[PDB]
Design a protein around this ligand. Sequence first.
Ligand SMILES: C[C@H](O)[C@H](O)[C@@H](O)[C@@H](O)C=O
Ligand SMILES: C[C@H](O)[C@H](O)[C@@H](O)[C@@H](O)C=O
Ligand SMILES: C[C@H](O)[C@H](O)[C@@H](O)[C@@H](O)C=O
Ligand SMILES: C[C@H](O)[C@H](O)[C@@H](O)[C@@H](O)C=O
Ligand SMILES: [Zn+2]
Ligand SMILES: [Zn+2]
Ligand SMILES: [Zn+2]
Ligand SMILES: [Zn+2]
Ligand SMILES: [Zn+2]
Ligand SMILES: [Zn+2]
Ligand SMILES: [Zn+2]
Ligand SMILES: [Zn+2]
Lengths: 419, 428, 421, 421
Amino acid sequence: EFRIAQDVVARENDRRASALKEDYEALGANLARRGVDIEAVTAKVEKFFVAVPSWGVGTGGTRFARFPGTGEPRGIFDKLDDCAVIQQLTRATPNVSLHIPWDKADPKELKARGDALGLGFDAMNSNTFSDAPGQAHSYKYGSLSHTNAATRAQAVEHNLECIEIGKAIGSKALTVWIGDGSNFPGQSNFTRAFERYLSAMAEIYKGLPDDWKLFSEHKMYEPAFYSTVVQDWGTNYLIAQTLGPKAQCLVDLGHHAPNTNIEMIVARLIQFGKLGGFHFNDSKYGDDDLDAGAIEPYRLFLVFNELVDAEARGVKGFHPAHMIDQSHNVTDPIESLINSANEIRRAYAQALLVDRAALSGYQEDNDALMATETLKRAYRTDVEPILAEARRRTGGAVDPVATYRASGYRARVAAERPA
Amino acid sequence: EFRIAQDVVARENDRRASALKEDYEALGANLARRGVDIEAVTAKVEKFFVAVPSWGVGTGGTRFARFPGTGEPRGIFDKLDDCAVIQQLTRATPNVSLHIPWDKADPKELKARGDALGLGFDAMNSNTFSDAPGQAHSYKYGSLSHTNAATRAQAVEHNLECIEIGKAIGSKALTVWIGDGSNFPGQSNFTRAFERYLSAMAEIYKGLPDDWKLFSEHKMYEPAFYSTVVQDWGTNYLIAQTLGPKAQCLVDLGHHAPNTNIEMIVARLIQFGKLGGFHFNDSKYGDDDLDAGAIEPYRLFLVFNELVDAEARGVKGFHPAHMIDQSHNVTDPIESLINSANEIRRAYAQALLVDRAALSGYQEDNDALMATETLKRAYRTDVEPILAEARRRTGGAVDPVATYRASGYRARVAAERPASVAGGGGII
Amino acid sequence: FRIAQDVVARENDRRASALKEDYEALGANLARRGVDIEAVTAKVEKFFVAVPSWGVGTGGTRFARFPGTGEPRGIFDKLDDCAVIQQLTRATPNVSLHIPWDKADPKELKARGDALGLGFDAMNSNTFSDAPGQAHSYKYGSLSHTNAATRAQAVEHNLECIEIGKAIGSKALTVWIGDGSNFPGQSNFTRAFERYLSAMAEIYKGLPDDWKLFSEHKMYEPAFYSTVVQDWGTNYLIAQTLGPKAQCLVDLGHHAPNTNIEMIVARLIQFGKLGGFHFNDSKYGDDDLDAGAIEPYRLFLVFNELVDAEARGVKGFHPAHMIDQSHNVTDPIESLINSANEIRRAYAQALLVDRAALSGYQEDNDALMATETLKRAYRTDVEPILAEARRRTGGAVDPVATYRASGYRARVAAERPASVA
Amino acid sequence: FRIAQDVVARENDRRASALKEDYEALGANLARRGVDIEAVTAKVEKFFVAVPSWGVGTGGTRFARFPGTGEPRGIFDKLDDCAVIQQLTRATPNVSLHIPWDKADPKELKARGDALGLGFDAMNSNTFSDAPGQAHSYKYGSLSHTNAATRAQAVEHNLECIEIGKAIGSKALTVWIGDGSNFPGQSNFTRAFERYLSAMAEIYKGLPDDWKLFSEHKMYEPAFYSTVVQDWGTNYLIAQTLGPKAQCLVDLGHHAPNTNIEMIVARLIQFGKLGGFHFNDSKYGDDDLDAGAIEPYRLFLVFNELVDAEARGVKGFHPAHMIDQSHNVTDPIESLINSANEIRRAYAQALLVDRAALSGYQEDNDALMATETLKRAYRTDVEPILAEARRRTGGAVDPVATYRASGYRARVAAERPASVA
Ligand SMILES: C[C@H](O)[C@H](O)[C@@H](O)[C@@H](O)C=O
Ligand SMILES: C[C@H](O)[C@H](O)[C@@H](O)[C@@H](O)C=O
Ligand SMILES: C[C@H](O)[C@H](O)[C@@H](O)[C@@H](O)C=O
Ligand SMILES: C[C@H](O)[C@H](O)[C@@H](O)[C@@H](O)C=O
Ligand SMILES: [Zn+2]
Ligand SMILES: [Zn+2]
Ligand SMILES: [Zn+2]
Ligand SMILES: [Zn+2]
Ligand SMILES: [Zn+2]
Ligand SMILES: [Zn+2]
Ligand SMILES: [Zn+2]
Ligand SMILES: [Zn+2]
């Protein structure tokens, strides 16, 4: 079934078809002059997928306030309906990332709805950074690393429950992000808290299926404002290495200290086989959770440059889990996710354009200027025609947001859902 | 009224009196060898006050979750009862800073309760960074700088109402902090948004009594994550200078970019007569709103060094409105505010110990090492005895938190107030 | 001609076919967007940025300096090299001189410039290092030094820079100093600033009627605890205090981490104190890297503010544009060439923004379409426009490739002896 | 003796009375807290930190260096000055050498050291700068350079440092390089790191059985885009990969803004890879300022982690501490003296923490009392302890005061020719 009427998609595509053909053929000629087959690029782009977060489908907020828009999803099922629009139009988000207990519901029905909507399920996300109804022990002072054994045990069990839910819907991974840390010096004993966390994670790993992966996600601060147990990629590596082969690190772009060279962290994790995946978003100050590429698009490209280089170097068994993790506080969540997915494919596409042979030559000869210019020749290329054509060829929209607004989808759900 | 039984305070003070006398007398001798009269210091310390935020006596949270404790205050009246405890025990927080609409209530009752509790009222705080029930225009895309004229007018009207409430309870200032800004490049036109803000604030300024002050508070980011209209002290200065003599700038410790030299900003505002006041707290990453001095006590001292240097050089027309602005997410809010107020007096006391003449000499001689060492000799001095003695002589507790816990106050209000439920934050 | 004309012609011819195809393709695309590529090219070809005489030589850090071959031996060699950048990019007709590094007879400097087809931008004073025979050291400051005699000496040096500038055609004096402290208590923040203000008022006194005095703020380095002119707030107070001729200069790499620099630019413009820019890029501190090599979008956003100013019709708005970089691991000439290109690139893209649509989205608070409107301009590859602007004005379609084909570096390497001590 | 004994005795007696009063008063206060001041003093007088040979000379920035009087030239002058610091503070018995700056006949070095009462700590290699007559430049890197012969040269140099160290009593080699890139694409992050790991493996092979190899991470400078050994994560990967004799060095000012450094210290200790800590303070970047002059609490929190480990004696926890600072505006000797003092101060205060009480508040999640338990130790003025420790071990009650009374600076000023005067 189609959330967006097929005639609206066709109409909006036909209206822009002529211009797209002109832009695509022109770019094709330009790339051919550069020794690149535009068709080979498009083919790869239409294959690049990134999972959408269920928690990003509704309007987000801050500790200061939340300003909901119209037609806010009432639960996971409405969220899946809205996620179906993102996939239908961009064709880059076939899978949805669930968060428990927020999306708690009959797995069987979740699966049924997903299949009907043409959606799949990516990594499960546990939640021990907030208390649930009827919960016996509070996570106020931590969860997996809490000083109280009973609390750690409760956190572990919750994670195992997430695994059972995921197994029922076709998920093959569990992502663990906790707020565990301290707001005051002395509040926690850094080492003992980390020891407790490792012990609890070992239990989760013990209950992890052999066809699943376990992702730990580091974050410098927030909700903890002095120390955080899994504060950076260094601690994250120690975690993954200690836990086992099925345990890897997840890198969320907005979770690093100011000025951090994040693309280097990505390369380091790849070299040691611990790059489990990504949580895409953009930011300027802290963990802003803004639309990917909206603030520093070149950084996004540089991260993808390390991903594409890994293949070029011949790295094996490298299949990162790509996921979007954003908060949409002042825009229509669907439009933001649409353009964010587009931005991610944009950076990927540009990374594919890099002349690796030329770059390698300039790196060996220490020709810094030509090396950086080689990356820019790729980054400066406007790949929108390729992105648009990929969508068109796969059942999507030439201009996703334009088609979305032309459909009146938002007003529609605004009438079907409360206020 | 005495929130904390006098017998407990006396009991807990006598239990520590002997140790205090020994420490106080020892410190006094040391200071004497330093040409300092401990009594002169203690006298000023007893008179140093910092306002407490009404919204700070309740447990705070993040966008991810809130973990309330027991006996959470229901509203302004419970909050005043809790603030009274802080004042009774530390004697450093005689005034409370109200926030509207949160603390909206009959002005007469507020004033009545404050008087009974021995609490006065500091600067009023307006709220146009969130929407209230029945609100005609949403502040989602801004308030005083919103592109919609009606929305700005509504924001202006609200601020004027805050001034009316303040006049009825004894307040003499309005503090304006808004979230206005943008999350994406292009979303806002920086200049036009600021022009709109200046015009709206000019309307609020017109409603100020002659003995009132309007304080604008800058913040680099949050809730806006790309740009903020009142992002730094520079923009804040432009506001104060444009609005008028009664308009000044408020400096909130955690509202600056990483590595910012905050004490310099303080010195600059003082130099140009626009230091309206301070919003105390500490931080390590962003606007963490942590207990004052819990992360960087030296920085807190350095800020007070600028305050004392001015307070000494006569600098007339210098009466900064000091207030604590913190969020207590993992501690009993009352205990945190108590120790925070203590840390602020600690920094003050230490700044008072600085040998101004010696420092001036080293500055003129460019003796950087001795200059910084002159500051350290004051900072390194454990002034706890002075703080404890000041509290004792004014009806406070030698060890505030120890007395607070010995009184069983938290268990008391926990048994009088409805239970609270932990929940998520505004993230979803 | 520093670079042989036949080389430029040959290299331009070699790339003519591809340029035509890309330019005309871009022209059609822009036309579909209601933009006249010819109008953009006409503006781009007139956008100039001054080159720092001190950036033509290889730079270094406190840890080491690794010079390349043919390092300029003095200001005259530097002008010769600056002529190469201008001839090939046609984007840098003016040079920024630094005194005493570039001290020489004004008559000869002017004559050399005229002969090379170069002009002179704002003069730059130097009281952040000690020169031979100096009566007072700037170790503890200059214009804000506690010692009156030291400040007087600093003032006289700045007045001397104005005299030199008047003789060569300059119309401004840029003042950046290292004055500050490395320890709390070392300096009295207020008194230090007052001393600076008094010294600057004297310098202002020596300004011709058509001259400007630019003060440049910097968060830290060389001072590591406090700096007198630490940020734009202090900078604004300086310009407002000094007078009409005093304005603020924004050096991109001089701000605290995560600072929204484009907002500072907008604020200074609103209050008429944006004197000019020192373009460069950075990731950590005042890295002084090639403009746009690290955060090209930020560079674009700064230009978006400059162009919006023109759109809003700000009166008498003529910021002084200058590159202030250090080239530690590349051929200084090649980096300056590509840096000048990046600046014209960001400028060109800013010109492409559909202001009409943007204006609408800002009013309707359509944040997504507003940012997408900026992106549609930024994502456009304007290289064809930059290349055509150069072709039309006697420059090179691909500046660096032409520079390399000319063998210039090897030429000056043989002509210039490397310093031995 | 560098400083006349009668001067030391005179200035000590001058302050003996007040010191008695303060020490006895603190001893009483500590007794009421269940702490025996004598146990603290005994440990403090035994706490040492190596002094960098390159720290006694005036430091500079990329803009300038303002030398003071009596600047030490050569390792022999430097050792003479380092002897003053040790004699007065008794906290710096060992000096860390840097090759090739301090190159000299090992036997003469060992001799001068023994004569001055100074030992030698970790050796420090230098492949972040080029020495005259060098076959291959380190402009584009050293141990991770793309050119094999260049890496081989860097490796050989480090081995030579080990040979020098074995001859003078050293037991470790510290490796800090500037290797990195200033532009995206310039280096392939992974390949560069692979080359570095391979080169370090060769150096590791040259290590005696009782030697250690320390690698030092740094976020940036001299490289302003990427640095091979950029943080503790990469550093840990290096140490774990090389072997048991390889550990990581943590330099306070080499971290990203707001980094929780004390946690990094805890993590490395937990995994047995904390080789040592390089002390200094900072506010903006790698400012290399006097320890504790900016954030003394942070210094205390680092020692809180160190003392907690020293108490339990953790596996492989035997840190090799050193001061790594640059003194640009003070008498280097005085700064090193007060920096060593601050280090012992934070150590003494950390020793005062009631670990039992702390652990109790941590287990009950009583955050307020836990942080207050730390503060009760930190707020304690341990100067009386530091001064008594010095007095008992042949040092000065007030180091800097005694230094100034001795007229030492004026003395070496008369023996050493300044660059100009
Ligand atoms: C909801 C989700 O678990 C969350 O966003 C984490 O992944 C992390 O990004 C939090 O800062
Ligand atoms: C509640 C109060 O308005 C608020 O705390 C502001 O003062 C500012 O700190 C916000 O970040
Ligand atoms: C050389 C020139 O004066 C200098 O670069 C200043 O402009 C400033 O950028 C310093 O950081
Ligand atoms: C000279 C010494 O190797 C150097 O200072 C390194 O240790 C590190 O501090 C670099 O910033
Ligand atoms: Zn995430
Ligand atoms: Zn996050
Ligand atoms: Zn505040
Ligand atoms: Zn705040
Ligand atoms: Zn500059
Ligand atoms: Zn600079
Ligand atoms: Zn070091
Ligand atoms: Zn350093």
